[PDB]
Design a protein around this ligand. Structure first.
Ligand SMILES: CCCCCCCCCCCCCCCCCC(=O)OC[C@H](COP(=O)([O-])OCC(O)COP(=O)([O-])OC[C@@H](COC(=O)CCCCCCCCCCCCCCCCC)OC(=O)CCCCCCCCCCCCCCCCC)OC(=O)CCCCCCCCCCCCCCCCC
Ligand SMILES: CCCCCCCCCCCCCCCC(=O)OC[C@H]1O[C@H](O[C@@H]2[C@H](O)[C@@H](O)[C@H](O)[C@@H](O[C@H]3O[C@H](CO)[C@@H](O)[C@H](O)[C@@H]3O)[C@@H]2OP(=O)(O)OC[C@@H](COC(=O)CCCCCCCC[C@H](C)CCCCCCCC)OC(=O)CCCCCCCCCCCCCCC)[C@@H](O)[C@@H](O)[C@@H]1O
Ligand SMILES: CCCCCCCCCCCCCCCC(=O)OC[C@H]1O[C@H](O[C@@H]2[C@H](O)[C@@H](O)[C@H](O)[C@@H](O[C@H]3O[C@H](CO)[C@@H](O)[C@H](O)[C@@H]3O)[C@@H]2OP(=O)(O)OC[C@@H](COC(=O)CCCCCCCC[C@H](C)CCCCCCCC)OC(=O)CCCCCCCCCCCCCCC)[C@@H](O)[C@@H](O)[C@@H]1O
Ligand SMILES: CC(C)=CCC/C(C)=C/CC/C(C)=C/CC/C(C)=C/CC/C(C)=C\CC/C(C)=C/CC/C(C)=C/CC/C(C)=C/CC/C(C)=C/CC1=C(C)C(=O)c2ccccc2C1=O
Ligand SMILES: CC(C)=CCC/C(C)=C/CC/C(C)=C\CC/C(C)=C/CC/C(C)=C/CC/C(C)=C/CC/C(C)=C/CC/C(C)=C/CC/C(C)=C/CC1=C(C)C(=O)c2ccccc2C1=O
Ligand SMILES: CCCCCCCCCCCCCCCCCC(=O)OC[C@H](COP(=O)(O)OCCN)OC(=O)CCCCCCCCCCCCCCCCC
Ligand code: HEC
Ligand code: HEM
Ligand code: HEM
Ligand SMILES: CCCCCCCCCCCCCC(=O)O[C@H](COC(=O)CCCCCCCCCCC)COP(=O)(O)O
Ligand code: FES
Lengths: 533, 42, 184, 58, 73, 223, 51, 139, 101
């Protein structure tokens, strides 16, 4: 019945499309199981949730700048003039059952999408996963991050509330028009005239629901296809070489783990959507150029840019009756940052001279200069991000606002230098900590007094020993070293049973023996594969 | 003062016999131990 | 043939933590001497129909904790787990009973800002309740550790010192309960 | 010592508690100004409202 | 770098030229000094900028002198 | 009332003279003249505990009041007798008005608040930073009369809003908006302080991302 | 509206949506992770890159 | 370890005498009667030394002489394993950073920061307590 | 009492009607409403990027990313005593651009 049906459908599919060999190649593909290789798929799942909830939102949203009088249920805004966009954003959150939940899941998913992209980028950079043959795919990811930043910005600009409209007036309108020679032409091409105009929100809506997400989808497809057919990197370890992939096959283990991780990410984003308020636009009011509120932060992934605006000094030039205003610096700065991010693999292969194929990753401690540089970059990013929140920090943490500006200004130079130096020394220090275990074995923490009164700590050797009993020094192999005896199995196991009642002793004995035999067989399999290759 | 400068990680590669509150002094000047017991009281 | 080092450290720390409650008792007695005859003052109506059963549950948690200690000294990890789960449930019941008493006291106008009696009552009993919550966290952490490795003497020592802390909390509560609900 | 990790914790608690108390000086009002002995009621919220005093306490 | 200084020197990028750090320090100090040009009317921050620039110049100069004299490599 | 006037002077003499002068004229570089500030200024400054001030810095904070209601009335009467000025609105029984100050048009109040108030106090009266150590405070604790007199008297660096610039009915609409935006629950979960992007981005990093990475660590392997 | 009898229950609607949805798919994901970890065979596979 | 118990018992004798004397001398001819703060502090200082001294005295009468309690013990009497002493840990600084987070939260009265600091403290203390008890990862 | 501390801008010496001054509410840095008006310091604070303008010295920037003063509106009264504008701004209002001045 259920088996004959599967065989019949399988034969029908195979006689018509003969996919057996290609499907089997997909089922046998091996992926490494490292926890940090799951960071990219948080971004993928966030993007999928964004697509689903965004499609739901487009069924109710009218992105018009046409001014109307609010006639809905939210009493504190009755009679207030607003755009159709603000109108329908309110209608979603009050007049459609589940609309507020969908809207909040969309916005939380956008935040998790940007944050996931950042953390996954950090893994790629610090482990060296960008090196050849994978330079292009770092470039594709860099473009994906830029597109995600601007997509999220356009998305939260759509409701045309006071806060987001203030963000549009300063960043999208002010910086753009400040651009030299072509600034005002770019402004009038984008807005159709002066700010705010009547075309901006419908145009941003078209960019946000179709055009930018289509480019993102195409780039994500290229990205995942490159990963799939270039065969994911791995960390050094037992049995791992430059020419193999150690891990699990797709069918069934990796497929089950991916599906379960997708379900758990969805659960977290769903709990956030209905437990934490995000962007309650009815409290902000519709956008009016005469109004503003304290605390005009953008979403976090834009804050650094805003932070840069806050920190850069009022340096302007007035050549021959023209004006180059302060915001131009910020624009140039952004370009520079992006250009340095896209170009990093080629910069590093030019500096280091290393142009070899690489499939084995580097532990971040073992590349101290790149780790120091990335730590320096993260320090600058965090300083600019917190500079953007300097007014909130001043209010909550009792710091002068002027002082926060100057702390950001000086720290923008000093903090990355300090962080670079500290991260460099810390990475080399971890290298020395690994060396110590390699020469002496694992410190067990057990102190012993010898008969003549010496105090010695017992060590657990990781390899062969002498006739004197000291271990032979082992060579570093790019892989982590154990430093706790409990992580080597010294603690044993409690004893089989439920939490409150023991199982029969014979069951416990059989289970423990089977577990030890299985662990030994797995170690032996990896060892003999390593010995053979 | 009955160990090296600086001490090792676990402070002692050996200990002397402890028979008073001046064990390092008795370690370094054995000939004085008798005097130390004889002259202790005014 | 030698002292249990973790035991002596725990006892020494508990004796120090007695001085912390000394400060709060001093605050209570200073406010009581300045009462002027009305202690507790209106509208505070303490009720023993609920304080007494909560006190008795906390006292019985000491016997259940001692039973867990006997199991641990015997090497029986499962008996230790059962008795410490019972003790955790009883101390959690004490915390909830105290919270219910707090809620009924606040509705009738006994609060920290409201009166000097409310200030001393709530700092004394609330810091004791915080100590109880810390002890419940200690039970949770100890019980999770017994699932991590085999039951060694060090693990049993950890159980014993957690019980030392629980007995300290129970005895401090007996002293606080005597001075608040009977030496008014 | 009997408890090496507790010893390390004691040092780090010293360092960060001292930094918390001194950080009153980076607030606009400034650090505690009621003396090291902190006599009452000078230290109450009515007579020493600033954040410097609370940072000193914690 | 030698492996006595950086144990994993053959596993990754382990050496940054000293001229890069010396010049970067001097340029960072100069940038701190150029932010005295602005619209601000107070001088507390001018003293902070001067002090941080002085510390940076002193650190760069000490490092450069000790490398020249051979005391550090 | 002469008794109320002598009680106010008696209270003033051992609490306010060091900074404001025996004749309410001010002590230079220590405290301003109080002539013409009015009973409303006294009510706002003393009922929110800002007065008596304890030191000079960027901004004098609010704190627990040093006087009760009748003492506040006495001090306000004493100050009113020296120069007049605005007074605190009262109800039929002569109590300081609280409920009758809640206006009936909260949409107008919200529009007025966003034009006049949210620049310094934020979209929903959560507070905002000012220039150098100063700040517009969170509005969630002020009672209606405190809001009304705060607009009426222009405290510290808050602009002064006269009864001609903002009529009493406009002020009552504003106080209705301030009170209702303080007492309304959040609709989409925990309100996260009401500041928006900064605490939302903090919640993503410390809750959502920490959860996601912990789950990845649980599903994945090490080394 | 503000100060109405129904405002408190209304304020829990979206939180309850998120609690019941988020928990549900969260629990299914946990259960599937556990099934992989406890019942699907443990495996080590090696693929040649041919790159 | 009889000297260790004796030290605390001697302190206990002095503290108990001081507490009784102070309470009686302030009850009589002192304004207001018993001075409650100092009396309470002296009584519970007595209790502190009493708890520790009673514990030491009970321990002493159990175990016979240790090599550090023996006037002519040999160094070789102390041969063998002493116990476990943690070789390294970065969990103490994490615990202190967490507690300082909660303390800054309490100083500035930011309840969300207090909540975050308490959660950090619980996680860091779990990290310390489990550091030498986590088994190998399972796959 | 603060009128002796007012410094006039060239070309704008008569733009005030006694002790009433009118400046553009649009910030000259990037166009936000720069409307946090501190009456005692006479400081106009922009909430967006923390520019500060000196209201006594013709709204000249004294802190932040703003390099240019806020434009002053000339004001007067008519026969009925209502405040009216006494002409236009004498410079462009709002954020700067390549073509300006
Ligand atoms: C508001 C601020 C905070 C908000 C936080 C909200 C977000 C919550 C995040 C939830 C984390 C996701 C983890 C899900 C796993 C659940 C499945 C499970 O049983 O895992 C067992 C798992 C062991 O399985 P394994 O993957 O084989 O472990 C490898 C080795 O055995 C282990 O080898 P090892 O020795 O290298 O690793 C040991 C490691 C154990 O910790 C971990 O490895 C996980 C830590 C995740 C940190 C995330 C990265 C962020 C860093 C930046 O030691 C610790 O650091 C102990 C930390 C204390 C435990 C957590 C207590 C928190 C209580 C809060 C009150 O260990 C844990 O993860 C236990 C810690 C979590 C306890 C369960 C809490 C669930 C409910 C959370 C909210 C309530
Ligand atoms: C510690 C290590 C170093 C050595 C040991 C100790 C050194 C520190 C000693 C500093 C002493 C300062 C005075 C203390 C008293 C004080 O409290 O202040 C006084 C008053 O001052 C202000 O009034 C000014 C007048 O008195 C008023 O008459 C006037 O009216 C007012 O006018 C303003 O205002 C008006 C409107 O009101 C406008 O009309 C008008 O135009 C104007 O704007 C004035 O103000 P203004 O000039 O703004 O500020 C200036 C104040 C303000 O205080 C200050 O010193 C500012 C604080 C400076 C902090 C220094 C930072 C040090 C750098 C770091 C160490 C770098 C990192 C390194 C760390 C580790 C390194 C290891 C790796 O004096 C000074 O700077 C003093 C000058 C000297 C300062 C010292 C600099 C040393 C560093 C250089 C060398 C580098 C180091 C070497 C390296 C190898 C107002 O505030 C008043 O309220 C206030 O009362
Ligand atoms: C994967 C999972 C993801 C999901 C996570 C979900 C978690 C969130 C909870 C779920 C939501 C519940 C369902 C429906 C929502 C609900 O039913 O909600 C009720 C109301 O709730 C709030 O009302 C408070 C009062 O009830 C009102 O009376 C009052 O008016 C209101 O006042 C605001 O409004 C006024 C205007 O009038 C202003 O005057 C005023 O100032 C203020 O703004 C209040 O709000 P507020 O103070 O914000 O929160 C205070 C919170 C307390 O904090 C919180 O729990 C917030 C926690 C999340 C924040 C995370 C921040 C992370 C920080 C970083 C880690 C930083 C550190 C890193 C750097 C370190 C540096 C070192 C190097 O209350 C308390 O329980 C206090 C007691 C104890 C708190 C504990 C509760 C739970 C957690 C406990 C943690 C363990 C131990 C216990 C802790 C003490 C406001 O939202 C209201 O809208 C809302 O209506
Ligand atoms: C560029 C720039 C902005 C510069 C200013 C930087 C600066 C000086 C910041 C520090 C401010 C502080 C902490 C002031 C007091 C002084 C002080 C104690 C300083 C530190 C002293 C010190 C180094 C020693 C002690 C040890 C130590 C390291 C202390 C811990 C410090 C901690 C944990 C403080 C937090 C630091 C910080 C700036 C965090 C920002 C948090 C953010 C952005 C949260 C946003 C947010 C807010 C603001 C909410 O209102 C809210 C409401 C409801 C729910 C959630 C939130 C929420 O998350
Ligand atoms: C309105 C409202 C209430 C909500 C809005 C809707 C919304 C935001 C989202 C709902 C849609 C959504 C994201 C659903 C998630 C469903 C999931 C992920 C269920 C998985 C459950 C599960 C693990 C069951 C067993 C099947 C297994 C073991 C896995 C199969 C499997 C699955 C399920 C994958 O998703 C997957 C993805 C990528 C590669 C491979 C796989 C794969 O093999
Ligand atoms: C820790 C945080 C403690 C919070 C204290 C708190 O908010 O309680 C004060 C409050 C009394 O407020 P009140 O002005 O009397 O009006 C209450 C009207 N329902 O209600 C109370 O009186 C709360 C009673 C105290 C609760 C226990 C706190 C433990 C103390 C440890 C510090
Ligand atoms: C910035 C220039 C402000 C504007 C515009 C408004 N307010 Fe304000 N307010 C400001 C400050 C700096 C202060 C504190 C002053 C003090 O003397 O300490 C205040 C104070 C208030 C208060 C008192 C709040 C209390 O602590 O409970 C209220 C009720 C208040 N402000 C309300 C308010 C309203 C309704 C406004 C619009 C008309 C308004 N403020 C404008 C700063 C500024
Ligand atoms: C929308 C944003 C992105 C998504 C959804 C995404 C998704 C993924 C996924 C799932 C993987 C494979 C699994 C893994 O290693 O984690 C991956 C790999 C990769 N990503 Fe990303 N990525 C994004 C952005 C980026 C960024 C910003 C970079 C770096 C600039 C980057 C570079 C790479 C590289 C080089 C790999 C292959 C690494 C390897 O084999 O180990 N990606 N990406
Ligand atoms: C990379 C993917 C995306 C990101 C980062 C993103 C981000 C955002 C953000 C932050 C908002 C503001 C949400 C709010 O109201 O609070 C928003 C609004 C919106 N988005 Fe998206 N979005 C993405 C993809 C999509 C897609 C594919 C669609 C269309 C199917 C879509 C449709 C909408 C609509 C209609 C709104 C307006 C309605 C509203 O604000 O509630 N989004 N987006
Ligand atoms: C996807 C829709 C239908 C899914 C059913 C196909 C998979 C089961 C059929 C084969 C397995 C059982 C043995 C069997 O019937 O052997 C044969 C069927 O399988 C084949 O030979 C071709 C199968 C290839 C198609 C699979 C593509 C995608 C399927 C993946 C779904 C997870 C028939 O056995 P027989 O001829 O009797 O020896
Ligand atoms: S818009 Fe005013 S400072 Fe930027």
């Amino acid at each position: 019945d259920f088996a004959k049906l599967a065989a019949a459908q399988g034969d029908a599919i195979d006689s018509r499309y003969h996919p057996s060999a290609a499907v089997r190649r997909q089922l046998n593909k091996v992926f490494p199981t490292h926890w940090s290789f799951l960071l990219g798929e948080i971004a993928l799942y966030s993007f999928i949730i964004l697509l689903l909830t965004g499609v739901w939102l487009t069924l109710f949203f009218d992105p018009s700048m046409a001014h109307v009088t609010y006639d809905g249920v939210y009493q504190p805004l009755r009679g207030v003039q607003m755009s159709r966009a603000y109108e329908t954003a309110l209608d979603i959150s009050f007049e459609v059952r589940g609309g507020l939940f969908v809207r909040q899941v969309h916005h939380w998913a956008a935040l998790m999408f940007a944050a996931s992209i950042m953390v996954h980028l950090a893994r790629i950079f610090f482990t060296g996963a960008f090196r050849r043959p994978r330079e292009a795919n770092w470039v594709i990811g860099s473009l994906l991050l830029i597109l995600a930043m601007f997509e999220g910005f356009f998305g939260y600009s759509l409701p045309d509330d006071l806060l987001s409209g203030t963000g549009i007036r300063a960043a999208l309108s002010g910086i753009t028009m400040g651009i030299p020679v072509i600034g005002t032409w770019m402004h009038w091409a984008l807005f159709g005239g002066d700010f705010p105009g009547e075309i901006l929100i419908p145009r941003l809506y078209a960019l946000h629901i179709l055009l930018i997400p289509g480019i993102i989808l195409a780039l994500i497809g290229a990205h995942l296809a490159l990963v799939w057919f270039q065969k994911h990197t791995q960390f050094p370890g037992p049995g791992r070489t430059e020419t193999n992939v150690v891990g699990v096959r797709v069918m069934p283990v990796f497929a089950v783990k991916s599906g379960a991780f997708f379900a758990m990410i969805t659960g977290v984003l769903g709990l956030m959507g209905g437990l934490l308020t995000i962007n309650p636009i009815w409290n902000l009011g519709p956008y009016k150029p005469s109004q503003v509120s304290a605390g005009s932060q953008p979403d976090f992934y834009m804050m650094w840019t805003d932070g840069l605006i806050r920190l850069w000094p009022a340096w302007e030039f007035y050549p021959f009756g023209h004006t180059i205003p302060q915001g131009v610096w910020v624009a140039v700065g952004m370009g520079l940052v992006f250009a340095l991010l896209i170009a990093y693999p080629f910069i590093e292969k030019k500096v280091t001279g290393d142009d070899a194929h690489h499939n084995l990753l580097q532990r971040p401690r073992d590349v101290p200069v790149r780790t120091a540089i990335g730590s320096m970059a993260i320090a600058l990013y965090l300083l600019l991000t917190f500079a953007c929140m300097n007014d909130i920090i001043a209010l909550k943490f009792h710091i002068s606002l002027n002082a926060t500006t100057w702390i950001g200004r000086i720290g923008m130079v000093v903090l990355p230098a300090i962080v670079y130096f500290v991260a460099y020394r810390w990475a080399i220090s971890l290298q020395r900590s690994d060396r110590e275990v390699l020469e002496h074995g694992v410190e067990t923490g057990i102190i012993k007094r010898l008969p003549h009164g010496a105090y010695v700590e017992l060590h657990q050797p990781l390899g062969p020993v002498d006739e004197h009993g000291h271990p032979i020094p082992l060579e570093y192999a790019g892989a982590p070293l154990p430093k706790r005896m409990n992580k080597l199995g010294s603690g044993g196991a409690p004893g089989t049973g439920s939490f409150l009642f023991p199982d029969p002793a014979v069951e416990h004995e059989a289970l423990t023996e089977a577990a030890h035999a299985s662990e030994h067989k797995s170690l032996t399999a990896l060892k003999e594969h390593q010995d053979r290759i | 003062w009955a160990t090296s400068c600086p001490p090792p990680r676990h402070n002692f590669t050996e200990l002397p016999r402890i028979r008073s509150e001046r064990p390092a002094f008795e370690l370094h000047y054995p000939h004085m131990v008798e005097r130390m017991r004889a002259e202790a009281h005014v | 043939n030698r002292p249990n080092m973790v035991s002596v450290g725990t006892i020494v720390w508990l004796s120090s933590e007695l001085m912390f409650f000394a400060g709060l008792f001093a605050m209570y007695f200073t406010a009581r001497a300045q009462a002027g005859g009305a202690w507790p003052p209106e509208p505070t109506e303490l009720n023993l129909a609920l304080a007494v059963p909560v006190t008795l549950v906390l006292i019985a948690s000491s016997f259940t904790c001692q039973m867990g200690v006997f199991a641990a000294e015997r090497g029986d990890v499962f008996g230790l787990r059962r008795w410490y789960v019972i003790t955790f449930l009883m101390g959690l019941f004490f915390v909830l009973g105290q919270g219910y008493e707090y809620i009924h006291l606040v509705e009738h106008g006994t609060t920290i800002p409201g009166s000097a009696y409310g200030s001393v009552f709530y700092l004394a009993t609330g810091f004791h309740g915080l100590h109880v919550i810390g002890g419940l966290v200690a039970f949770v952490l100890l019980l999770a550790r017994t699932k991590m490795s085999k039951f060694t003497p060090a693990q049993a020592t950890a159980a014993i010192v957690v019980s030392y802390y629980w007995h300290f909390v129970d005895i401090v509560w007996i002293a606080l309960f005597a001075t608040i609900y009977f030496v008014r | 010592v009997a408890f090496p990790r507790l010893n390390a914790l004691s040092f780090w608690l010293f360092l960060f508690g001292a930094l918390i108390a001194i950080a009153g000086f980076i607030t606009p009002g400034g650090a505690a100004d009621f003396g090291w002995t902190a006599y009452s009621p000078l230290t109450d919220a009515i007579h020493s409202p600033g954040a410097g005093g609370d940072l000193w306490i914690m | 770098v030698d492996v006595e200084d950086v144990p994993s020197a053959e596993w990754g990028w382990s050496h940054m030229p000293i001229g890069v750090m010396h010049i970067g320090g001097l340029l960072s100090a100069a940038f701190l000094l150029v932010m005295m040009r602005g619209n601000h009317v107070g001088h507390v921050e001018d003293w902070f900028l001067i002090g941080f620039a002085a510390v940076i110049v002193a650190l760069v100069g000490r490092n450069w002198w000790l490398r020249r004299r051979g005391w550090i490599r | 009332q002469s008794a109320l006037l002598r009680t106010g002077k008696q209270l003033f003499e051992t609490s306010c003279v060091s900074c404001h002068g025996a004749n309410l004229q001010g002590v230079p570089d220590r405290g301003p003249s109080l002539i013409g500030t009015g009973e409303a200024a006294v009510y706002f400054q003393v009922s929110t505990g800002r007065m008596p001030a304890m030191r000079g810095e960027a901004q004098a904070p609010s704190k627990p009041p040093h006087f009760d209601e009748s003492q506040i009335d006495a001090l306000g009467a004493y100050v009113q007798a020296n120069g007049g000025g605005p007074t605190v609105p009262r109800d039929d029984h002569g109590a300081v008005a609280q409920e009758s100050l809640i206006g009936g048009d909260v949409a107008r109040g919200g529009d007025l608040f966003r034009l006049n108030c949210a620049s310094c106090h934020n979209f929903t009266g959560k507070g905002g930073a000012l220039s150098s150590g100063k700040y517009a405070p969170d509005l969630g604790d002020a009672n209606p009369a405190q809001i009304y007199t705060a607009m009426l008297t222009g405290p510290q660096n808050m602009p002064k809003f006269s009864d001609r610039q903002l009529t009493p009915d406009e002020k009552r609409d504003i106080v209705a908006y301030v009170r209702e935006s303080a007492e309304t629950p959040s609709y989409g979960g925990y309100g996260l302080g009401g500041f928006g992007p900064a605490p939302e981005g903090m919640a993503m990093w410390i809750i959502g991302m920490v959860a996601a990475i912990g789950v990845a660590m649980w599903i994945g392997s090490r080394a | 509206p503000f100060g109405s009898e129904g405002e408190f229950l209304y304020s829990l609607a979206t939180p309850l949506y998120g609690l019941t949805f988020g928990l549900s798919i969260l629990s299914i994901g946990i259960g599937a992770v556990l099934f992989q970890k406890k019942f699907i065979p443990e495996e080590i596979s090696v693929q040649d890159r041919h790159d | 370890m009889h000297i260790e118990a004796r030290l605390f018992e001697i302190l206990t004798a002095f503290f108990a005498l001081a507490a009784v004397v102070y309470a009686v001398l302030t009850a009589m001819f002192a304004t207001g009667g018993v001075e409650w703060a100092g009396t309470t502090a002296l009584v519970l200082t007595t209790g502190l030394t009493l708890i520790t001294g009673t514990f030491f005295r009970f321990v002493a009468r159990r175990l016979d002489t240790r090599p550090e309690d023996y006037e002519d013990a040999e160094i070789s009497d102390g041969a063998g394993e002493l116990g476990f002493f943690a070789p390294h840990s970065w969990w103490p600084i994490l615990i202190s950073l967490s507690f300082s987070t909660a303390a800054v939260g309490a100083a500035l009265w930011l309840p969300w920061l207090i909540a975050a600091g308490v959660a950090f403290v619980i996680t860091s203390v779990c990290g310390l307590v489990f550091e030498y008890y986590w088994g190998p990862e399972k796959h | 009492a603060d009128m002796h501390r007012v410094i006039k801008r060239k070309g704008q010496e008569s733009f005030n009607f006694g002790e009433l001054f009118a400046y553009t509410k649009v910030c000259s840095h990037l166009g936000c409403p720069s409307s946090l008006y501190e009456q005692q310091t006479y400081r106009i604070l922009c909430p967006c990027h923390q520019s500060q303008f000196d209201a006594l010295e013709f709204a000249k920037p004294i802190f932040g990313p703003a390099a240019r003063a806020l434009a002053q509106l000339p004001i007067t009264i008519d026969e009925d005593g209502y405040l009216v504008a006494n002409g236009d701004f004498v410079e462009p209002v709002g954020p700067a651009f390549w073509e300006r001045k």
